[PDB]
Amino acid sequence: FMPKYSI
Amino acid sequence: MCPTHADSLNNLANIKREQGNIEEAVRLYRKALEVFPEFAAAHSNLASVLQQQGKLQEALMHYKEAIRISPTFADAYSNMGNTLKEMQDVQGALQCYTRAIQINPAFADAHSNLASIHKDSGNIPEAIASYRTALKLKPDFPDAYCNLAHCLQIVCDWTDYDERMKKLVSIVADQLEKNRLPSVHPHHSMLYPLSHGFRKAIAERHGNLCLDKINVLHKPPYEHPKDLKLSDGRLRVGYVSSDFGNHPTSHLMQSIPGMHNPDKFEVFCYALSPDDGTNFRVKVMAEANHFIDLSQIPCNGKAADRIHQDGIHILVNMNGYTKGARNELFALRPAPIQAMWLGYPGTSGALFMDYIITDQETSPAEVAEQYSEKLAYMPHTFFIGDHANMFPHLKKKAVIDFKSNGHIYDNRIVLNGIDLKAFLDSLPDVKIVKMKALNMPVIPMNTIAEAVIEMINRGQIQITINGFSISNGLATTQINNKAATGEEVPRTIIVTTRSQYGLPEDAIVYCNFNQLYKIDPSTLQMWANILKRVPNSVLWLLRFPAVGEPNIQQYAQNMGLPQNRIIFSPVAPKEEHVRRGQLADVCLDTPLCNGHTTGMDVLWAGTPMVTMPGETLASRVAASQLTCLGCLELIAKNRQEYEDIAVKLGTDLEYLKKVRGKVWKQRISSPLFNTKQYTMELERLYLQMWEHYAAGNKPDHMIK
Ligand SMILES: O=c1ccn([C@@H]2O[C@H](COP(=O)(O)OP(=O)(O)O)[C@@H](O)[C@H]2O)c(=O)[nH]1
């Protein structure tokens, strides 16, 4: 469940 | 026994059948077959009209004969296929269509019918391919043309859009003159620039298909109640739906049966669908005074009888021309008052419907000519949603401040949870931002914020902080399937972030989570104008369906937008869908056909929605929602005004904060999401309808 980019 | 005797009967009968007297056509055809049994064309024609009469088992026997007698009879294979499809044997229909095509490769109708099976099954490209084949083979083919048009609308292929719209109108106009069943479906007619007159005429002709199917039952009129004496002063309301289950309709009105006042009302839910096992069905079954599974009573005669025996005063049609409808029930008039409500955003066009429940904003008197029914106005909006009950975890949010020395945003990192207050009270340092009752807790960037962010970034399912369960908002389905669908309220705290969906952290997000079929070229132009005037803003859309994305991205490039200006996300479970609306700044409503359920979904997240109401019911719902909410500044008189409002909300961050705060307060404070108030107003309206009937009046507009 990966995000499209890193905060 | 003679062949040309029988031949003559067949021609006499294609005559009666052409006129429109279906009943005599049958008697002729049947004499033709006593005279010449091995008469393929008679068997095929008798079968065709038996199918219209809904005598499928008998039609199927005669198609089989036609084929036995004439094995090259592609036409009979094609119509036998359609009979099997209506009988739910899609397997057998498919075999019929394919066999027709092998025997006669040049036979267009079988290609069209193969396309319809694909279309029904969600295979839109496979449908487009077969409709295109049918039209190469037979270029004047309205059924194929209009179904291809709807396929193209669904995937947002706007090749020759204006010419296509012109031709759909032309086909409907020709078909209404020439007295055929129009190839445009009434539900689809809201999408094309037909006249109000034409849309109502299309509806009326679909209604008449029910009359053919109930005339074969030869039932007399029912005696209706004239008073409330046998029901103890209680008005008997019958809600009829194929959608008591996991369907939008239930996500709107599942609380209403239970909220009816037992002193004055007795509520019957007539389900047209079997129990799908979901809590939506459980609740309606549990809370209605009576629940009747009409799926177990396939005969419209016996089902209408059952309604009539229950002694219904007002029967409410929640399907209109949608999948699962049994309008035959309503055509048999088992109740003295029969009302359209909520599920179908158009007119029945039919004599057997008395009222449509709507409101002054949705259906103003100036456009009454588009409805065959009398208007019955609810005081605010006819629209309602169960969001207060299904999604109470979104009544309050908190955020994380991660920019630190920068902005305190309300929609980049969001926490929601029934136990959020307790989790916050366990934290050392929580800034509370007053909202010039209401306030947004702000978790500062401590090591706890880092752990939450870590979870989101590593894509972990969940973590634990001070004993509280913290869920990744992308994993709701693994943690609690029932919470994901809206059947349960989530029992964890859920984190939702722009990073999860690839939305830019430093930009205005304009969302539209509708099905792409509601977009036309003009709408995307409007959106492109807004994006060009609000640099770095993005438009957030859904793969709904996915094959629509490349089409929209292409039209957008031709408008001069780089690819990254439109961001597509997959369709999600109900709860993720409603929750992730919290990430948007503004929602841009589709003027062609508004967000309906979708409108209530974005407003529940506190997301302002800009709409331009048109003339159709379907184009005015979002404005009706917004006037009830109390946000008249989000309603545009024209495209210029729409673009201006959108652009103002994207450029003036102080105005955006004010309008977002308005929506966030008023979703609770206004009537829009108040099921108890809604039910009580619906009750006030039911009693008007009834008093009017009891005083011996035919139905008339109810505006007071
Ligand atoms: O990612 C999404 C987008 C939408 N929906 C739901 O899918 C249904 C769409 O129904 P429809 O197209 O009838 O929307 P309406 O026309 O009522 O706005 C609604 O219940 C939405 O809540 C969803 O679960 N996930």
Domain definitions of chain B by residue range: 1-140, 235-385+678-694, 388-501, 509-672
B435 Cα distance to chain centroid: 36
DSSP type of residue B512: -
Using CB atoms within 10 A of its CB, is residue B31 exposed (0-12), middle (13-18) or buried (19+)? middle
Asked if residue B319 lies in contact with residue B327, where contact means CB atoms within 8 angstroms, the answer is yes
Using CB atoms within 10 A of its CB, is residue B335 exposed (0-12), middle (13-18) or buried (19+)? buried
Alpha carbons within 13 A on the beta-carbon side of B262: 5
Please choose, from the candidates B267, B348, B379, B282, the residue with its C-alpha nearest in 3D space to the C-alpha of residue B315.
Answer: B267
Of B461, B475, B502, the CB nearest to A4: B502
**Site of tokens 């064309």:** B41
Using CB atoms within 10 A of its CB, is residue B296 exposed (0-12), middle (13-18) or buried (19+)? exposed
Does a cis peptide bond (omega within 30 degrees of 0) precede residue B545? Answer: yes
Please give the helix or strand (H or E) that residue B271 lies within, else none.
strand B265-271
Helix-helix angle B56-69:B74-86, to 10 degrees: 160
B146: CB partners within 8 A, 6+ apart: B168, B171, B183, B184, B185, B188
Instruction: State the Cα–Cα distance between residues B271 and B697, nearest whole angstrom.
Output: 30
* Phi-psi category of residue B89: left, alpha or beta, with phi > 0 → left and psi -120 to 50 → alpha: beta
Residues with CB under 6 A from ligand 1: B 248, 251, 513-515, 542, 571-572, 574, 577, 595-598, 601
Question: What's the B240 CA to ligand 1 centre distance in angstroms?
Answer: 21
CB neighbour burial string for B379-389, b if at least 16 within 10 angstroms, e if fewer: ebbbbbbbbbe
Question: What's the B389 CA to ligand 1 centre distance in angstroms?
Answer: 17
Is residue B118 annotated as involved in ligand binding? Answer: no
Asked if residue B579 lies in contact with residue B586, where contact means CB atoms within 8 angstroms, the answer is no
Q: Which residues pair with B357 in a beta bridge?
A: B376
Q: Which residues of B touch A2 (CB under 8 A)?
A: 459
B657 Cα distance to chain centroid: 32
CB neighbour burial string for B299-317, b if at least 16 within 10 angstroms, e if fewer: ebbebbbbbbebbbbbbbb
Instruction: State the Cα–Cα distance between residues B64 and B39, nearest whole angstrom.
Output: 12
- Technique of determination: X-ray
B497 touches chain A (CB under 8 A): yes
Q: Which two tokens stand for residue B194?
A: 């037909």
B432: CB partners within 8 A, 6+ apart: B439, B440, B441, B442
Pocket probe mutation, ligand 1, options B321, B601, B617, max atoms within 8 Å of Cβ: B601
Q: Where do runs of H (alpha helix) occur along B248-381? A: 248-253, 256-259, 279-287, 300-310, 328-331
Q: Which two tokens stand for residue B428?
A: 């050392």
Cβ distance B497 to A5 less than 8 Å, yes or no, reads no
Q: Which two tokens stand for residue B33?
A: 């077959």
**Site of tokens 């894509």:** B459
Instruction: State the Cα–Cα distance between residues B518 and B373, nearest whole angstrom.
Output: 25
Domains B1-140 and B388-501 share a fold: no
CATH architecture observed for domain B388-501: 2-Layer Sandwich (3.30)
Instruction: State the Cα–Cα distance between residues B217 and B647, nearest whole angstrom.
Output: 59
Q: What angle do CA B37, B39, B45 make, to 5 degrees?
A: 115
B500 touches chain A (CB under 8 A): yes
Instruction: State the Cα–Cα distance between residues B692 and B675, nearest whole angstrom.
Output: 26
The full length of chain B comes to: 704
Instruction: State the Cα–Cα distance between residues B452 and B429, nearest whole angstrom.
Output: 16
Instruction: Spell out the CATH class of B1-140.
Output: mainly alpha
CATH architecture observed for domain B509-672: 3-Layer(aba) Sandwich (3.40)
The sign of the dihedral angle between the CA atoms of B501, B502, B507, B512 is negative
Q: Which residues of A touch B505 (CB under 8 A)?
A: 7
> Structure resolution in Å?
2.8
- Per DSSP, which regions of B68-139 are E strands? none
End-to-end CA distance of chain B: 69
Instruction: State the Cα–Cα distance between residues B614 and B619, nearest whole angstrom.
Output: 5
The strand pair at B493-497 and B439-443 is best described as unpaired
The CATH classification number of B235-385+678-694 equals 3.40.50.11380
B250: CB partners within 8 A, 6+ apart: B241, B243, B244, B280, B281, B284
End-to-end CA distance of chain A: 15
Q: Which residues pair with B271 in a beta bridge?
A: B241, B293
What one-letter code names the amino acid at B493? I
Alpha carbons within 13 A on the beta-carbon side of B380: 20
Instruction: State the Cα–Cα distance between residues B486 and B394, nearest whole angstrom.
Output: 12
Instruction: State the Cα–Cα distance between residues B317 and B270, nearest whole angstrom.
Output: 10
Instruction: State the Cα–Cα distance between residues B96 and B612, nearest whole angstrom.
Output: 47
The full length of chain A comes to: 7
Instruction: State the Cα–Cα distance between residues B251 and B389, nearest whole angstrom.
Output: 10
DSSP type of residue B402: -
Q: Which residues of A touch B479 (CB under 8 A)?
A: none
Please choose, from the candidates B248, B357, B332, B241, the residue with its C-alpha nearest in 3D space to the C-alpha of residue B294.
Answer: B241
